[PDB]
Amino acid sequence: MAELKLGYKASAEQFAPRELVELAVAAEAHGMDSATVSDHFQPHQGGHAPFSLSWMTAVGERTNRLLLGTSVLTPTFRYNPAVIAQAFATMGCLYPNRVFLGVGTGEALNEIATGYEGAWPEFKERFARLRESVGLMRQLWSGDRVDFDGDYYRLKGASIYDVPDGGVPVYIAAGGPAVAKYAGRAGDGFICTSGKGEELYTEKLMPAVREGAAAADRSVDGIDKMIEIKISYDPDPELAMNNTRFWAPLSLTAEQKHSIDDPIEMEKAADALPIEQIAKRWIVASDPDEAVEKVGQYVTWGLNHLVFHAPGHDQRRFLELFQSDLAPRLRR
Amino acid sequence: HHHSSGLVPRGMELKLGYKASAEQFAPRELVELAVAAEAHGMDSATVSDHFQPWRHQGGHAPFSLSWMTAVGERTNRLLLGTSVLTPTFRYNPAVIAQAFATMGCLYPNRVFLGVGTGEALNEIATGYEGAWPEFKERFARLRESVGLMRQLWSDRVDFDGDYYRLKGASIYDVPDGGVPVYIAAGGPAVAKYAGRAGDGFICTSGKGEELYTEKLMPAVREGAAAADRSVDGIDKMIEIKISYDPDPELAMNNTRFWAPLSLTAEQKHSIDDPIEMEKAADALPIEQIAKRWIVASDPDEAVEKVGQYVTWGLNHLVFHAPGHDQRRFLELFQSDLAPRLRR
């Protein structure tokens, strides 16, 4: 649903497994409503990739209220969607009403590295694979026996024996109108990322979600509209600026992010970015009122679940500042 | 004042552990039973990894890797692992390698990867196309997948096998000490492989002395010698199938849930449908099913039959009790059996 939530982005790219879990526990301690993790097989310099589903489970077992999920996981290539259905159904049983599945169309880098053969599929196929996998998983979460024969995936007499009462809510990530519309039509949730220009949110994404919801005769209000807020808020401006540097890959173009299959190629192109250009993606701020005004814009544009990704290694510092300075304002 | 890590290396004593049956219990119960096993003195708990139960009526299948991590966060001492997981079909071996590396970091010196050759009951259901491969290919897939994971574990890795590939792949977060890999073995050719490329082997009870003493053990010695490794580096694990209860009728009848284990090896590895398995399995009378189990109502007969395996060379005894009341079995184990078994 579309009440205001404030959550925390746990960056698997930046931290080792134990630290990544403990940070999410600190996020609960600091009042966050949710925590979400990137799902990567590999991020190199100061790089990490703890297994996302182990992070979800460890934090679940250590926490009481956080909604937990992926932002996002590709359920279409290295991961068998039936096994993903089983994994998240299990987690859903273990942490009732606290689990979601965040899905995307995929990145060449994860999939080529783990053994994908032949040409990296074009966007259209990655989208069709995504749609087909989501329906496959949903049929499985009914808890009945499923026979499935799609263009891409198959099941023969398959059941998930252990299914949560509230099902497994599916959040669909989009950087463009096409998948946003699919999200409005079919998603329990919708995910985007901040910093990419007022136009993308108001002119492409939000109207696409409304279009999809309308098209499928759905209340737009019942879709959780989630966004990862790229915020570099620190009373120390040097840190606010300098903390963004680690995150240069996020400032590469959409096609470099999805299609570069070589991690050497990827780090080169990230390294090529001047910090001033990196920073444009981020809310760089030393004043808490100004920071919240920038975030508040997304709430005006129709987003209701705001998940804060802070760029620096000192995440506990971020959480302290979030709790004392940002959250009271953000709540309103 | 310097504080040390306190971390004790793998460097493995008679161990008594607990089999957590994903086939029989829902996710939360399965976790909580592993916690009570620690509470009751167990050294270890292992979980079966399955997409589907053996049986339909009262069947369950919680995701094994979530069990492992949840139990990890909740326990202090238990060695934890899969007995066993198939890393060759529905699972990508690079992803398995990343999962266990991550778990081994989360739970230092407590995690192992237990692996086997596969059951169609897990793989056909999840979309494997074409006929279910014969044992020779499943074994050869297993061997390759283990090799891939070794190389991935530590560096940027290219791998080009007959089955699995890697391209520029790295695992960043690897545990100090690595990830012990235990191979399920029910013959000398897999037992030899286990000595050569594993850190442990897993067998089951009920197969008879000469399987263990004359087939499995000698083959483990041969594989390790071929690896230039002391055999004392290989943990010798057995799943002890025990139905222990002071009521003999109940100790016998409590095996019915596990009727499918009484079917042939053929049926168990190739039947793809729990409804089908169950129909085959339930036509069998109870005395036939009980044959698969150590059925005992006295601590002494129990400890005599269990102690055979220690005499034949096994050092890691993981107990699988078939009844629904697992907490009774843990209670009975700790008070009646454990003190005699320790020595």
UniProtKB/Swiss-Prot annotation, chain B:
Optimum pH is 6.5-7. It is an enzyme of class 1 (oxidoreductase). The active site is at H50 (proton donor), E119 (proton acceptor). One of its GO terms (biological process) is carbohydrate metabolic process. Coenzyme F420-(gamma-Glu)n binds at D49, T86, T117, G118, N122, G186, G187, A189, V190. Substrate binds at T204, K207, K268, R292. It holds the Pfam family Bac_luciferase. Gene3D superfamilies: Luciferase-like domain. Transmembrane segments: none annotated. Its EC number is 1.1.98.2. One of its GO terms (molecular function) is oxidoreductase activity, acting on CH-OH group of donors. It catalyses: oxidized coenzyme F420-(gamma-L-Glu)(n) + D-glucose 6-phosphate + H(+) = 6-phospho-D-glucono-1,5-lactone + reduced coenzyme F420-(gamma-L-Glu)(n). Inhibited by citrate. The keyword Oxidoreductase applies. Disruption phenotype: Cells lacking this gene display a strong resistance to PA-824 and CGI-17341 (a nitroimidazo-oxazole). It comes from the Bacteria. Catalyzes the coenzyme F420-dependent oxidation of glucose 6-phosphate to 6-phosphogluconolactone. Appears to have a role in resistance to oxidative stress, via its consumption of G6P that serves as a source of reducing power to combat oxidative stress in mycobacteria. More precisely, is likely involved in a F420-dependent anti-oxidant mechanism that protects M.tuberculosis against oxidative stress and bactericidal agents. PANTHER family: 5,10-METHYLENETETRAHYDROMETHANOPTERIN REDUCTASE, PTHR43244. This is F420-dependent glucose-6-phosphate dehydrogenase. It comes from Mycobacterium tuberculosis (strain ATCC 25618 / H37Rv). The gene is fgd1.
